[PDB]
Protein backbone atom coordinates (compact mmCIF):
# COMPACT_ATOMS: atom_id res chain seq x y z
CA UNK A 1 0.00 0.00 0.00
CA UNK A 2 1.18 3.51 -0.96
CA UNK A 3 1.01 6.22 1.68
CA UNK A 4 0.72 9.89 0.72
CA UNK A 5 1.05 12.22 3.69
CA UNK A 6 0.23 15.88 3.14
CA UNK A 7 0.85 18.82 5.44
CA UNK A 8 1.18 22.59 5.49
CA UNK A 9 -2.34 23.93 5.12
CA UNK A 10 -3.78 26.70 7.18
CA UNK A 11 -6.15 29.63 7.49
CA UNK A 12 -4.60 32.80 6.07
CA UNK A 13 -5.77 36.26 5.08
CA UNK A 14 -5.79 37.15 1.40
CA UNK A 15 -2.23 37.95 0.43
CA UNK A 16 -0.68 35.50 2.90
CA UNK A 17 1.37 32.42 2.27
CA UNK A 18 1.71 28.74 3.10
CA UNK A 19 4.03 25.91 2.17
CA UNK A 20 2.55 22.51 1.47
CA UNK A 21 4.49 19.28 1.55
CA UNK A 22 3.65 15.70 0.60
CA UNK A 23 5.74 12.63 1.48
CA UNK A 24 4.96 9.62 -0.72
CA UNK A 25 6.17 6.08 -0.11
CA UNK A 26 7.66 3.94 -2.85
CA UNK A 27 9.29 5.22 -6.02
CA UNK A 28 6.67 7.69 -7.30
CA UNK A 29 8.43 10.89 -6.24
CA UNK A 30 11.99 9.83 -7.04
CA UNK A 31 11.26 8.50 -10.52
CA UNK A 32 8.13 10.17 -11.94
CA UNK A 33 6.46 13.50 -12.49
CA UNK A 34 4.26 14.62 -9.63
CA UNK A 35 1.36 17.02 -9.33
CA UNK A 36 -0.33 19.10 -6.69
CA UNK A 37 -4.13 19.02 -7.02
CA UNK A 38 -6.90 20.82 -5.24
CA UNK A 39 -10.54 20.10 -4.61
CA UNK A 40 -13.02 22.68 -3.45
CA UNK A 41 -16.15 21.33 -1.72
CA UNK A 42 -18.59 19.91 -4.23
CA UNK A 43 -16.07 20.24 -7.07
CA UNK A 44 -13.76 17.73 -8.71
CA UNK A 45 -10.01 17.61 -8.10
CA UNK A 46 -8.06 19.82 -10.50
CA UNK A 47 -4.34 19.92 -11.22
CA UNK A 48 -2.69 23.16 -10.15
CA UNK A 49 1.04 22.48 -10.58
CA UNK A 50 3.31 19.77 -11.95
CA UNK A 51 7.01 19.00 -11.44
CA UNK A 52 8.80 16.74 -13.92
CA UNK A 53 11.95 14.72 -13.40
CA UNK A 54 13.81 17.20 -15.62
CA UNK A 55 13.02 19.95 -13.16
CA UNK A 56 10.51 21.47 -15.55
CA UNK A 57 7.49 22.97 -13.84
CA UNK A 58 4.04 23.76 -15.19
CA UNK A 59 1.33 25.80 -13.47
CA UNK A 60 -2.31 26.49 -14.20
CA UNK A 61 -2.74 30.10 -15.32
CA UNK A 62 -4.48 31.19 -12.13
CA UNK A 63 -1.45 30.33 -9.93
CA UNK A 64 1.46 31.31 -12.19
CA UNK A 65 3.85 33.64 -10.38
CA UNK A 66 2.28 32.84 -7.02
CA UNK A 67 2.91 29.13 -6.49
CA UNK A 68 6.16 27.19 -6.86
CA UNK A 69 6.37 23.41 -6.98
CA UNK A 70 9.52 21.37 -6.35
CA UNK A 71 10.43 17.82 -5.36
CA UNK A 72 13.29 16.35 -3.32
CA UNK A 73 13.86 12.87 -4.73
CA UNK A 74 15.98 11.76 -1.77
CA UNK A 75 13.32 12.74 0.79
CA UNK A 76 10.43 11.52 -1.42
CA UNK A 77 8.78 14.89 -0.80
CA UNK A 78 6.95 17.33 -3.08
CA UNK A 79 6.52 20.95 -2.01
CA UNK A 80 4.15 23.73 -3.03
CA UNK A 81 5.02 27.22 -1.87
CA UNK A 82 1.83 29.28 -2.06
CA UNK A 83 2.33 33.04 -2.04
CA UNK A 84 -0.13 35.89 -2.52
CA UNK A 85 -3.00 33.62 -1.55
CA UNK A 86 -6.46 34.45 -2.88
CA UNK A 87 -9.95 33.37 -1.78
CA UNK A 88 -10.23 31.32 -4.99
CA UNK A 89 -7.38 29.14 -3.66
CA UNK A 90 -9.51 27.80 -0.79
CA UNK A 91 -9.64 24.02 -1.15
CA UNK A 92 -8.23 20.74 0.07
CA UNK A 93 -4.84 20.13 -1.56
CA UNK A 94 -3.43 16.73 -2.51
CA UNK A 95 -0.33 15.42 -4.23
CA UNK A 96 -0.13 12.45 -6.57
CA UNK A 97 1.51 10.92 -9.59
CA UNK A 98 0.74 13.13 -12.55
CA UNK A 99 -2.23 11.62 -14.35
CA UNK A 100 -3.76 10.00 -11.27
CA UNK A 101 -7.08 11.75 -11.96
CA UNK A 102 -7.49 9.64 -15.10
CA UNK A 103 -7.63 6.47 -13.00
CA UNK A 104 -10.98 5.64 -11.45
CA UNK A 105 -9.30 3.84 -8.54
CA UNK A 106 -6.30 6.01 -7.72
CA UNK A 107 -5.35 6.19 -4.06
CA UNK A 108 -5.40 9.70 -2.62
CA UNK A 109 -4.14 10.89 0.72
CA UNK A 110 -6.20 12.91 3.20
CA UNK A 111 -4.88 16.16 1.80
CA UNK A 112 -4.29 19.37 3.69
CA UNK A 113 -6.78 22.18 4.13
CA UNK A 114 -6.19 25.70 2.79
CA UNK A 115 -8.58 28.53 3.60
CA UNK A 116 -8.06 32.14 2.50
CA UNK A 117 -10.18 34.63 4.45
CA UNK A 118 -10.93 38.34 4.13
Residue numbers in the entry: 2 to 119
Copy the relevant paper text.
Nbs are derived from natural llama heavy-chain antibodies that are devoid of a light chain and in which the heavy-chain variable domain (VHH) exclusively mediates the interaction with the antigen. The VHH domain is structurally similar to the IgG VH domain, with three complementary-determining regions (CDRs) that are responsible for antigen binding. We describe the introduction of cysteine residues at conserved framework serine positions in a Nb specific for human complement component C5 and subsequent site-specific labelling with Hg derivatives and structure determination by SAD and SIRAS. Hg incorporation did not perturb the structure of the Nb or its antigen-binding capacity.
We were able to crystallize both native Nb36 and Nb36 Ser85Cys labelled with PCMB. Since we obtained the crystal structure of both native Nb36 and PCMB-labelled Nb36-C85 we can compare their structures. Although unintentional, it may have given rise to new crystal forms as our crystals of non­derivatized Nb36 exhibit C2 symmetry in contrast to P21 or P212121 symmetry for the PCMB-derivatized Nb, and in both cases there are Hg-bridged Nb dimers.
